[PDB]
Amino acid sequence: ENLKLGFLVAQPEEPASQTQWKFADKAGKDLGFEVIKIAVPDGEKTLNAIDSLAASGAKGFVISTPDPKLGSAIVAKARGYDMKVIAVDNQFVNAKGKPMDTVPLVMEAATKIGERQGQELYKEMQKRGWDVKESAVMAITANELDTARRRTTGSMDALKAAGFPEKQIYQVPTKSEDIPGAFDAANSMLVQHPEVKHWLIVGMNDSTVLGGVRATEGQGFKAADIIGIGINGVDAVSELSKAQATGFYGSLLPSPDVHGYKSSEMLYNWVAKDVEPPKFTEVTDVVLITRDNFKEECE
Numbered sequence: 535e536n537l538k539l540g541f542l543v544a545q546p547e548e549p550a551s552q553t554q555w556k557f558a559d560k561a562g563k564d565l566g567f568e569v570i571k572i573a574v575p576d577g578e579k580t581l582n583a584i585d586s587l588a589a590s591g592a593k594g595f596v597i598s599t600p601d602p603k604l605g606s607a608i609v610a611k612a613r614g615y616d617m618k619v620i621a622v623d624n625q626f627v628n629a630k631g632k633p634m635d636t637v638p639l640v641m642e643a644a645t646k647i648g649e650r651q652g653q654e655l656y657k658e659m660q661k662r663g664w665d666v667k668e669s670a671v672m673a674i675t676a677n678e679l680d681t682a683r684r685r686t687t688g689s690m691d692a693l694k695a696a697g698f699p700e701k702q703i704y705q706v707p708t709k710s711e712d713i714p715g716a717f718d719a720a721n722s723m724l725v726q727h728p729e730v731k732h733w734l735i736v737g738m739n740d741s742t743v744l745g746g747v748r749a750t751e752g753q754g755f756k757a758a759d760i761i762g763i764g765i766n767g768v769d770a771v772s773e774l775s776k777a778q779a780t781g782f783y784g785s786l787l788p789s790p791d792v793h794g795y796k797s798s799e800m801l802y803n804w805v806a807k808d809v810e811p812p813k814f815t816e817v818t819d820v821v822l823i824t825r826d827n828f829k830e831e832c833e
Contacts, residue, residue: 537567539801540587540595541794542580544624546573549832550787551598554622554794558596561798567806569798570595577604584611593805594618596640596797602627605634618804620811622797633680638804638811640797642788644681647820648688650786651763654822655689655734656696658761658783664732671703673736674719674746676711682738685765689736698734708742716745724753732759733781740764740785744773747781757781767823774828789819 541558543551555571562569570592572583580600587595594617599608605626612619623641626634659669673690676682694700704727708719716737733755735746743762750760760781764770770785796817803809823831 537802537806538570538587538590538592539567539798539805540570540572540583540592540597541798542572542574542583542595542597544574544598544600546575550790553790554598557791557794558798561795561802565799565802565806567802574598575600577601577607580604581607581611584608584615584617588615588617592617594620594801596620596622596801598623599626603629603631605637609634609637618801620797620801620804622793635813638800638813638815640793640800640811640815641817642820643816643818644684645688646816646818647765647786647788648685649692650820650822651685651736651765652689652692653696654763654784654786655736655761656693656698658763659732659734662758662761664759666699666702668729668731669702669734670727670730670732671698671734671736672720672723672746673703673705674708674716674723674738674742675705676708676738676742679711679738682711685738686736693734693736708737708745711739711742713741713745713748716742717749718745720746720749721752724749733761735760735762735781737762737764739766740769740773744769744782750781755781763822770823771828771832774823774825779825784822784824787821787823788817789821792817792819 558569574580621639675686706719706723708715737743743764747762757779761783764785767785767787773782800811
């Protein structure tokens with residue numbers, strides 16, 4: 535009696551994780567299953583929660599792994615327990631760091647959120663009325679990462695498609711995904727292109743775009759002459775909460791409510807109705823938080 539399904543999140547203190555749990559519970563009510571919620575901040579507690587789920591009689595679970603390289607261990611343990619597994623937000627990888635494509639995955643498409651970035655950059659640019667002749671794109675890239683590559687390519691593609699001149703899009707590889715690496719990359723771009731008066735900053739995440747913005751400050755560029763939009767809002771609140779407006783215009787955040795609901799629904803259909811999910815299930819809903827709205831928006 536009464537189907538039980540797990541929902542495991544790495545970071546239960548995060549508003550987004552709490553939202554995932556909320557909307558999984560909503561999936562449970564709507565479809566008739568009980569949600570067992572367990573925090574999994576490390577590999578030990580990850581393995582424990584699975585053992586715990588098995589003993590409770592859960593037939594499957596959704597997980598946002600705290601470490602992608604936990605994938606093999608997760609898959610093997612779940613298999614011995616005959617429990618269905620769906621990954622949310624973070625893709626599993628093997629011992630060689632190649633993505634495990636066998637485990638169904640539910641998240642935003644990296645290209646699509648990249649494209650959304652390029653669209654919003656161009657929209658903020660058109661709004662400010664920059665002369666496109668004295669303007670350019672600084673794309674800080676980490677192309678050896680697949681998700682970064684797809685974000686920055688998507689962003690640049692959307693920018694090109696919206697009519698930004700391909701000749702004024704400049705790329706620079708970052709040596710690390712921190713502020714420092716992005717700052718070093720942004721710096722070398724600024725020195726190689728002083729004829730530029732207005733910069734659009736493309737990058738894969740908040741931290742990358744922020745290194746961008748920080749480097750432009752050091753070179754005397756004003757906020758009004760710099761547009762950068764982050765992805766996933768890791769730094770968005772503190773930066774947008776500042777007294778003054780900066781070159782960091784906003785951030786793109788995938789909707790955790792849809793991630794939570796949809797993953798749970800796919801898991802239920804698998805377990806209760808024997809409908810195997812596809813390898814990848816794209817969730818599109820993405821919100822832009824700016825200074826103007828991050829109060830009402832981070833509700």
